[PDB]
C-alpha cells in the first residue's frame, strides 16, 4: 500500500546496499551518485587534472534497477549560491556534471536541497539542465517544514533562540520553495520532498504546504518515539500529518541511523505500514472519485 524509500549518504558497495535495503522492505534507495566527500576541481591545475574514474560504473546495476530503484542525491559540497566566486563556479560545473550523470543513468528522480533563502543560482543551473535534452526525470527539492536555524537547541549563551511568535517568520521555508519554483517557472518536473522534524510547527506553517506538489515526505529516525515494548512509534500530531500525506499518495523516505538499536531497522517501515492499514476507510465519494483527483474535465 505505502511506497517507501531509504535515504543513505554512505554506500560502500552499491549491489550489497541495494539488496539489504530491498530485504528491509523498501521500494527504492536515495543515494549519492558521486562520493559525497569527493570534491572536484574544474578550473585550477593541478587538481583539475585528477585521473581515474570520477565515480562508480553504470554497469554495477541493470538499466531497470537504475530506472526504478535509485533516486540520485546532489553532493553536499555543491554550493551554487556561495559568496566565494571560485566555489560558485566549481559548484555550477559539478551540479551540471551530477545532473547529467543522473540523466545518463535514467534515474526516475534526483534530490536537491533548499537549505537557505537564496537559491537563485541553483535555480538557474537547474533551469538550464531542464532545457537540455531528455525531459522525463523529476527533481525533488528537499525542504524542511522548520529551518535548522529555527529548531537549534537554546545552548548558545550570547545568541538566545527567539521565544517571540513570528507568524510569517515561521513560514520562511515555504518562501524558499515558492521563490525557487517561481524562478524555474513552475516546471512540472520540480516537486517537494518535505522534511519532517522532531517537533511540528503551528498548523498555519503545515497548511502553508496545501496545494503544493509534494511527491515525498522525509522522516528522520530521530523524530520517532519509543513505546513500552521498545519499538519506534510517532506522536499523535505526527500521525495526523502522516494521514494527510497518505491522501496525497506521497512516497515516504526514512533517513538517519537506527536509533532503536535493540529493535532492528525495518521496524520504522513496519510502523508506517501499520498507520497506512489503520486509517479511515474511503467513503462512497472517495471510492467513486478514485482516479479523478485534480483531473480537469470540460463541463457537460
Amino acid at each position: 500500500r505505502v511506497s517507501s524509500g531509504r535515504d543513505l549518504n554512505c554506500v560502500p558497495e552499491i549491489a550489497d546496499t541495494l539488496g539489504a535495503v530491498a530485504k528491509q522492505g523498501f521500494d527504492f534507495l536515495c543515494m549519492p551518485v558521486f562520493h559525497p566527500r569527493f570534491k572536484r576541481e574544474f578550473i585550477q591545475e593541478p587538481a583539475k587534472n585528477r585521473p581515474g574514474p570520477q565515480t562508480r560504473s553504470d554497469l554495477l546495476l541493470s538499466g531497470r534497477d537504475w530506472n526504478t530503484l535509485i533516486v540520485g542525491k546532489l553532493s553536499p559540497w555543491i554550493r551554487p549560491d556561495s559568496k566565494v566566486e571560485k566555489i560558485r563556479r566549481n559548484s555550477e560545473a559539478a551540479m551540471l556534471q551530477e545532473l547529467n550523470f543522473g540523466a545518463y543513468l535514467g534515474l526516475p528522480a534526483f534530490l536537491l536541497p533548499l537549505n537557505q533563502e537564496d537559491n537563485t543560482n541553483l535555480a538557474r543551473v537547474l533551469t538550464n539542465h531542464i532545457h537540455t535534452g531528455h525531459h522525463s526525470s523529476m527533481f525533488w527539492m528537499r525542504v524542511p517544514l522548520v529551518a535548522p536555524e529555527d529548531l537549534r537547541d537554546d545552548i548558545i549563551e550570547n545568541a538566545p533562540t527567539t521565544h517571540t511568535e513570528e507568524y510569517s517568520g515561521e513560514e520562511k521555508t515555504w518562501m524558499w520553495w515558492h521563490n525557487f519554483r517561481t524562478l524555474c517557472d513552475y516546471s512540472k518536473r520540480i516537486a517537494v520532498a518535505l522534511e519532517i522534524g522532531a517537533d511540528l510547527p503551528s498548523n498555519h506553517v503545515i497548511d502553508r504546504w496545501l496545494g503544493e506538489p509534494i511527491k515525498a515526505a522525509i522522516l528522520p529516525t530521530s523524530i520517532f518515539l519509543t513505546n513500552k515494548k521498545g519499538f519506534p512509534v510517532l506522536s499523535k500530531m505526527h500521525q495526523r500529518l502522516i494521514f494527510r500525506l497518505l491522501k496525497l499518495e506521497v512516497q515516504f523516505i526514512i533517513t538517519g541511523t537506527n536509533h532503536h538499536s535493540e529493535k532492528e531497522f525495518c521496524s520504522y517501515l513496519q510502523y508506517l505500514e501499520y498507520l497506512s492499514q489503520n486509517r479511515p476507510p474511503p467513503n462512497a465519494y472517495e471510492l467513486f472519485a478514485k482516479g479523478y483527483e485534480d483531473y480537469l474535465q470540460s463541463p457537460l
Binding site: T55, L59, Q97
Partner: protein, 325 residues
Amino acid sequence: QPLMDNLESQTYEVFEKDPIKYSQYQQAIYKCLLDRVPEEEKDTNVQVLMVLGAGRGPLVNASLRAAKQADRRIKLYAVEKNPNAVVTLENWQFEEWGSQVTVVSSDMREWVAPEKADIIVSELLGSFADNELSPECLDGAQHFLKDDGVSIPGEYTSFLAPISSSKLYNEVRACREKDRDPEAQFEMPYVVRLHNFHQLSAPQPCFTFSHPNRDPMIDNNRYCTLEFPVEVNTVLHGFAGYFETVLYQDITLSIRPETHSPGMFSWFPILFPIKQPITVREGQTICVRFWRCSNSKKVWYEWAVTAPVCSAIHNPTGRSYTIGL
C-alpha cells in the same frame, strides 16, 4: 545525434546488443593488422590503434580480441567526448584493460595526440551514413593518422528509394507542434521501422565519403540528382534512406534491404517526407535532388522533387532541421 548530445547508458546498451557488428569490426582490424605487420616483425612492431568515439568500450574489446587472434602487438587509445561514458571506460581501464589502453576524455577534433596512429577505428554512422557527422569528426582527427595509416571504416555510401505510404504521410502530419512552423515536421528526417509502405524504385546511391580524405579542404557539402524509374501507378510520400560501409576490403556492413548485413537489427531506415503527396503514373520517372549543406556550426540536408512535378525545396538553410557540430 551522438555529437551534439550525450547518449544515455541504455542507448549504448542497445548498440552493444549487436554481436555481428563488432565481430565484423574485429575481422576488419584482424585483417588490417596482418597486412601491416609481417610475421617476422610480430614481437618488435607495436601498432598504434585509436578508437575514435569509444562509447562504453566495445570497439576497444574488439581491437584487443583482433590483436590476440592476429598474434600482433597493439597500443590502444580510447577517445570519447561523452564524460558519462568516460566513467564506464575508466572503470573498465582500471579493473580490466590496464596500461595497454589509454582513455582520452576529449573531442577527437580538439585532441592533441601524443603519438600518430597506424589505425583509427570508429562507429560514427547514422541510418543515412553521414547523418551523425562521421565525415566532419574523422576530418578533424585525420592529422594524427600516420601518412600510410588506415581508417576503419574506409568508406560509406548512403542510398535513397522513393516510397508510397499514406499511413506514414498521416503519421508525419500529426507531428505538428505549437510554437514552430506548422509544416516543419515535413522538413526533417525520421528513423522509422518502415512497415506499411511500397518501395517505388530500387535504392540508388546518394552520398559517398572516404577516409582518410586526400582532396585538400575536403568539402563535405554535396549535391546529388537521382532519377527513379516507376513501373506502377502510385502516390509519392517520401524517400527511404539506408547505407553501406566498407570497414576494410571485403568486410562490410549494410542496412540496404538487398545487401542487408546478417543479424544487424538495432538499425532502422531513415525517412525523408515531402509536404505534398505526388501522383506518379506508370512509366514516369521520379527525379529527386538532395543537398548536404553546412556552416561552421551545423550540417543539414535539403531536398526537392523535380519530376514528374516540382515540390518546394524542403528544409532550406536548415530552418526545420539541423545536425549540430
